[PDB]
């Protein structure tokens, strides 16, 4: 429900977004406002936005 996995690698193009690799796990913190979600990376602990078409629920 709130734990998601990256399906593809992604390199951030803004200071606000996270970069990640395929298979990295995230905790979602706010998915209410649009199709970019606020998340916390379970590898780095960093929080920022991720594109929701790049992740799926575990």
């Amino acid at each position: 429900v709130t734990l998601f996995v990256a399906l593809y690698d992604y390199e951030a193009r803004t200071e606000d977004d996270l970069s990640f690799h395929k298979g990295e796990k995230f905790q979602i913190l706010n998915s209410s406002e649009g199709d970019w979600w606020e998340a916390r990376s379970l590898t780095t602990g960093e929080t920022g936005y991720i594109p929701s078409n790049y992740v799926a629920p575990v």
Partner: peptide, 11 residues
């Protein structure tokens, strides 16, 4: 706002 930007294409 950051949430409502267009999504990137899938690879």
């Amino acid at each position: 706002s950051l949430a409502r930007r267009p999504l990137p294409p899938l690879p």
